[PDB]
Amino acid sequence: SPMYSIITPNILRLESEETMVLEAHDAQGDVPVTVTVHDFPGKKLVLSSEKTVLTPATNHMGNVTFTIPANREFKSEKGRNKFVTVQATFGTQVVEKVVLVSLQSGYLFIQTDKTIYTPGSTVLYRIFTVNHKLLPVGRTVMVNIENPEGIPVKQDSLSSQNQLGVLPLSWDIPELVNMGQWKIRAYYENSPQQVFSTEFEVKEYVLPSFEVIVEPTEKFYYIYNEKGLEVTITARFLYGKKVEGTAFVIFGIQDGEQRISLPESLKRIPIEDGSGEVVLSRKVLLDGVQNPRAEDLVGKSLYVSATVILHSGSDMVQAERSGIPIVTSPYQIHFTKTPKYFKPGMPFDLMVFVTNPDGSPAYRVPVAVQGEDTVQSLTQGDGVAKLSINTHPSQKPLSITVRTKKQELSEAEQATRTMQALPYSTVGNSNNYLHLSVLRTELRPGETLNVNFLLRMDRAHEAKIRYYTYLIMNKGRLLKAGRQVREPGQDLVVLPLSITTDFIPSFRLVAYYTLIGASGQREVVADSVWVDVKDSCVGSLVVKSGQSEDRQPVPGQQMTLKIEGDHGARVVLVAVDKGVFVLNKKNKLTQSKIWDVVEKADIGCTPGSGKDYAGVFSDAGLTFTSSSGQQTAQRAELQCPQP
Amino acid sequence: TKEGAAALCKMKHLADKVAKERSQELKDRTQNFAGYIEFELYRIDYWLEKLNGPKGRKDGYAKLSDSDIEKVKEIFNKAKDGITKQLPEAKKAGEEAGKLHTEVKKAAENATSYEENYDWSANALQVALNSWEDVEWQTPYKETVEKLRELEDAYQRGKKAHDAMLGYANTAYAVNTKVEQEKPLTEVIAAA
Amino acid sequence: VQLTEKRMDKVGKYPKELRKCCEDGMRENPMRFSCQRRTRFISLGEACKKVFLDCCNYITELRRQHADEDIIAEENIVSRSEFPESWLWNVEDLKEPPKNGISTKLMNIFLKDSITTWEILAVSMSDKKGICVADPFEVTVMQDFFIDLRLPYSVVRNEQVEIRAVLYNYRQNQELKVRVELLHNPAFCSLATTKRRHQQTVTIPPKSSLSVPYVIVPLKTGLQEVEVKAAVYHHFISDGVRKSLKVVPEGIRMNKTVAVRTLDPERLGREGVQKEDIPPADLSDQVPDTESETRILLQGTPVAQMTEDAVDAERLKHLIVTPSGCGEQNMIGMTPTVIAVHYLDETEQWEKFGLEKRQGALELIKKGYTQQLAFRQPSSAFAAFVKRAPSTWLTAYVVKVFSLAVNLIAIDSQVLCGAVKWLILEKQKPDGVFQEDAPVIHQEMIGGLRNNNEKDMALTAFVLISLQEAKDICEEQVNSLPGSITKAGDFLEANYMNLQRSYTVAIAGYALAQMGRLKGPLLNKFLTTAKDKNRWEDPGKQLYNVEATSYALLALLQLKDFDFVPPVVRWLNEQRYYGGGYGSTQATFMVFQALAQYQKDAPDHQELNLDVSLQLPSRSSKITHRIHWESASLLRSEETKENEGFTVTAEGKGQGTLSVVTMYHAKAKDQLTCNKFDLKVTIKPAPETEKRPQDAKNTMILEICTRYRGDQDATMSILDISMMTGFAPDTDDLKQLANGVDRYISKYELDKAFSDRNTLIIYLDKVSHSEDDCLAFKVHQYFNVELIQPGAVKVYAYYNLEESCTRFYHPEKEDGKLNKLCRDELCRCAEENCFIQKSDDKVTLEERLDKACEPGVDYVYKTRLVKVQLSNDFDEYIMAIEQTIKSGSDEVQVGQQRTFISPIKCREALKLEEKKHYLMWGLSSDFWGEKPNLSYIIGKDTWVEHWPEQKQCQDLGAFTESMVVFGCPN
């Protein structure tokens, strides 16, 4: 009973290198295989027949790599999206599958000098073009600069050929020009349906005489804190001397986009030696809004506006602090990376990402599972903590509850979270289950990782299974594939995987197997797991000071800077004021932002295992098909399923 | 006598002017009423649709009071209903004038004084000029005056229809740029 | 008590709609206008006025009953926007022998002269690896000692300004000992002398600033340099400052046109030769010791100067002599250049002028469009000012300009077609007349019940002309354009005969000719109304008659009648009065377009072969110019530094222009009579309790009211206030006036430096004729100055510059304290140049006789003072000559009065009293001009002595006895 199966990504991109996996079970001798690609409605032979021999020395495993040339669409107006048929003839029998195709491939990153501009200033911006593998590529781009009202003001078309991606550009702001949030769009000529845009604001000329800073003593205001919100105000000149005078401070509550100013929160404070304190009491805050319930106001933010007036001079400066989210619990527990499906009998692992109210990851915050009081898994540096629990044999939905137990905090202040999961059904009702477990550590490029394979099924027929087939997905493409041999009698297996730079920023491991099946129909069992790797540059770039540490540089003096980088690398430099950079927090061009953009466009959208054998493959981004009836459902949507 | 020759030359010049200037001009001024009535009906319909339509932010109409919207819609509907009935009168008149102009042009084609050019009148002077002149080419001149008077009556019908249409046309445009500013219900309904 | 709290509590009431009115009412009006008076200026509905009145009454009553800092906390918070300009914008590649993948590179940067923390960002883009970003690098630069010299923008000649320098120390718990010195400069009299240098030691305490004042008396005009040096003890610091200041003559710079003539030897000239005489300019008010300059410009073609100026961006703004801040005037960037480009595109002149400048002209047009986009409203309508009611006239003009510019640059179709649709569907009335719902700008107002139809006809004609251009651009988008055009044309033709004003007749005729309906008696109206077959003029209007003539010329060109055209061209050419061309933007654009159209549509080519000969009276050699068509540049220039009249001979062929323009400095005096205005300026002190800023030293209040002198003004009047040395306006009051609900002014710029002195230009929408429109504001004086001179205020309309007037205001003083910054030596440095310094109070007879007779001495007069006239800038002495000792070049009889002019600073030096005998003698340079009874300017070389009518009496009589013994034989 020989079997032949072929696996391919759900979506195949044009002008990109794609790979397909061929495997055979219960085959003797050489097994030549020929794979071809044709148009869905008609036959065009977009790709030449690719032939590969699945020799027994390779344990009947192979792969074929090809890239679909860009050709005229057959059904573009007659259909919404174009489909392509891919077939493989292993022996007498043949297999076929329909695959969705897309053309979008590449990214454009826009870097800007500043975020706040004034009339007459010059805007200097650059554009970097990258391919699927985040490498330089030469293609034509078109860039437009548009005013807030939506009327384009500037248009240009450039080419990155004979250059390393960098496309310097400059623009001059007219003296009398529209004021608002101007936009800069850029997109490729080949694919105008995808546009990458940035935004920059232009404001009027303003220059305060003295700097006033108002900030609260705490980042967040607890609901039951009877002390209230304490805010400190300082005022100082640019030449060192402090500011002495009188200040008026008003509090208010901002929700959604609207803001309500509390009429009973206006206070006058004498600022002496550039220092002042104000307090907003709980009673006034509660009585300001008609909402009587204290728990209902959770979610709204608190803002403070302060004005300072000097004694001798008439100069005035206004400052405001917007934010201070209101939270009833400092720590928050989130169920994002954990799988939402559980295998009966198999132990179940959960991941909790403790985060601060602002959004930064937590550190040194114990967490546990309510009801069981298991070992308190301390949160790691990344903020992810792993908790294991034993599932019940009953075929019922599973419910879990998790709570943090940080010391020197009240019981009420402790956060809580709940999660629900459904059982994983078995095609043959044989209770066959596979579990892939990974020890969660601070893994980074250059560190081996041990993956443990566990099998659960009856003892009637266990000698049939002697190997497992595993594949790794990273950035959509099939990074690697292989087999793990299991000797009879060993339920648990260990696989050492070497983590390299290619695995950045994360990967997904899908491991499965097949058996003859007592009923008569061959049974396939699969499992999936996701692992995250530290995000860092492939190479390295350092900007130190070559000048000796003699004394702080004085204005006008010449100094030297040491720039260390990869061999043959194009380095771009810019000197921006510290105040502008610190004032800007959303348009910062960091490596983390680039990796987030790269990871956002992923074909697979699922935390872990699915619901069925085909569900795992579909969620992981693979399509499993074979000669027999075992086949996966086709995909007819480029985007992942909407929540 | 030279007076007869001068009168004949004057009559020939007037006939040529009527054939080449008045006839062509008259027809072109009769088919414009149909193109204007329909255009104004379309503009009124568009204005009504924009009022309380699928979206808002229609200048001052967005904040217009609920009560005033009902009156605006009622007056717009009344004007639209009133203006529609005038279309066929102009439509038939246009074709009638075109046919009559073609007939008059065919008839005209079948068929001292320079100092008098100050007259600058060729409306109904042909028959009267022939009247003073009298006191094969003569026979066609008899029906030209009758055809010209019939054309004048046909054009007068369309002119009267257009003038009557103005009564209902002007009211909608008034309330439009009246409410278009910051004018509250008071003045609006007071004038309506 | 707690006035701010009461204001906030009162503002708490009312909804979010009627709260701006109350908040504005809380503000104290800069002027003393009652709440009822203020409510008249509210442009909102009838509900805002009620709340405004209620809040005004409540706050007034509360403050009166009350009678700390009473300032309302700002609701819209603002942050710092100006930041240091970014630098280090460069790209480099690392090309060095790598070591295990590491490639080092050393940079050489130059830190800027500033004290701030800089951040360097590095982004790398490799091939094998890819894009990567490194962390920012922080560089901190600061200094321990800082010096900053503060100087005024400008100083008038012969003034007493007190400049200062600020020393800043950034050390903690350590005082700084420094020595500060000012280096002598011969240009101005300083505390330091050539023999003795001024130095002083000062101790700066920790974390504090120190002020070192200085006094300088400028003498020479131009640009001067002031440098201050500071040396720190115990530390090797040798920092210093050097700053440039401007000294300007005592007067107002005025450039005046002398003559504008048309050169055409063949037709205008006789026997193929033309002779033209340019008389001398009338420089009867030149300030003493000032130089004038005369410029003669020969233009081969009538449209050469404008064509060359439009292409260049630097000289583009010189085509007008008025500010351009509002909507219509912002079109100055687009309308001229486009026309120039078109005039160069159709005619074969690009090769000679230069093809490379075409791209620059297109860039200017693009920038003009970008600036014009600012005035667009969401309803696809353009208003006169930002956030104002849309105007049909401005929208039509913008539509026409955009339609013209669509071919050259990428003009968005959406905006243009939407503007056309808005003009057609909304504004147009069923009858076919375009309505306006915005204040009038171009004197389109109705002249009365009988003249009501004139406004409708003019507006309909203008809108039809604008729309006809936007016919083939997007006709499918707007399918109701032909019907509107036909209706407007029919309406214009129906009432064309009943037209009286020349402008309306001209515009209607041009529109009808464009459509092709100006035939028969209608045409007789257009040609006959012209006066002398040359022009379309109306009484009382100057800059509108030229526009009407341009419209008539365009209509004639359309009608294909070239016999009547040439006469109008000459009249249009000879209409350059302001400076060297046309002032108003509209008139300049219309003349340019009309002349370009005439040149383009010429039945025959008039080749240029002009030969011009100029023979100045002062210059011996004659100058010859040859203007030919093949010449790349058809503009010739000549400059002279003397007022004289000269003859010019023109021969050959072609029509050219000759413009002679004179520039000189005029004296400060109030205009004898305004044309159609009545301006009044008053500067007064202010209460000392006002909270002046840190740097300001004094404060005053200036009021500037005016009223029209006609039936009505409308238009857009512009006020120009020339500030003083040190005085600056208060921006808070101007902002309150402009952005307040009771809008008293339209817009204030305060961002121009066209004149040497600081200026403030205020834009006003209208000037009331029945009553007097007035405005006042506070000004602050920072620097301490003495002997300050008065400023100026000019009120004028934009489109008609002839209707204008000027007034002069001086800081109130009237005190014989003769305050002066001197203490002991500085005035001795000032009176040296006033007049010849006698060696002693009473020098010996021999010395007097020796000094009296010199080669330069020409006149010696013994006179008796008659009267002395007080003034501000120059003192006047009416004097009668009694006896003559030595007659000069001019012949004066006994008993003839000759006035004398002296500097103000010499008032206490000469010590002249009325009805007293005196003797004096000077040089031939004292003669001023050649007017009858020429004035005598008392210069440095002007000896004066007291003549008595008792040892002193005996000595003076003995001295006198020897004065007339001989007639200076040697």
Numbering used by the authors:
A (entry chain A): 23 to 665
B (entry chain C): 35 to 145, 203 to 226, 256 to 312
C (entry chain B): 673 to 739, 752 to 1633, 1643 to 1663
Provide the authors' own sentences about this structure as they appear in the paper.
With the exception of the disordered regions Ala666-Ser672, Arg740-Leu751 and Glu1634-Asn1642, C3 was well-resolved and could be modelled in its entirety. Positioned above the loop (Gly684-Lys692) connecting the two N-terminal helices of the ANA domain and the N-terminal side of the longest helix in the domain (Ala719-His738), binding of ISG65 to C3 is predominantly mediated via hydrophobic contacts and four hydrogen bonds with the TED. Three hydrogen bonds are mediated by Tyr293 (Tyr293ISG65-Glu1110C3, Tyr293ISG65-Glu1111C3 and Tyr293ISG65-Glu1119C3) and one by Arg77 (Arg77ISG65- Leu1109C3). The interaction between the proteins is further facilitated by the almost perfect complementary fit between the convex tip of TED and the concave 3-helix bundle of ISG65. Within the interface, we could identify two possible hydrogen bonds, Lys97ISG65 – Glu689C3 and Glu302ISG65 – Gly717C3.
In this work, we report the identification and characterisation of invariant surface glycoprotein 65 (ISG65) from T. b. gambiense as a receptor for C3 and its activation products in human-infective bloodstream forms.
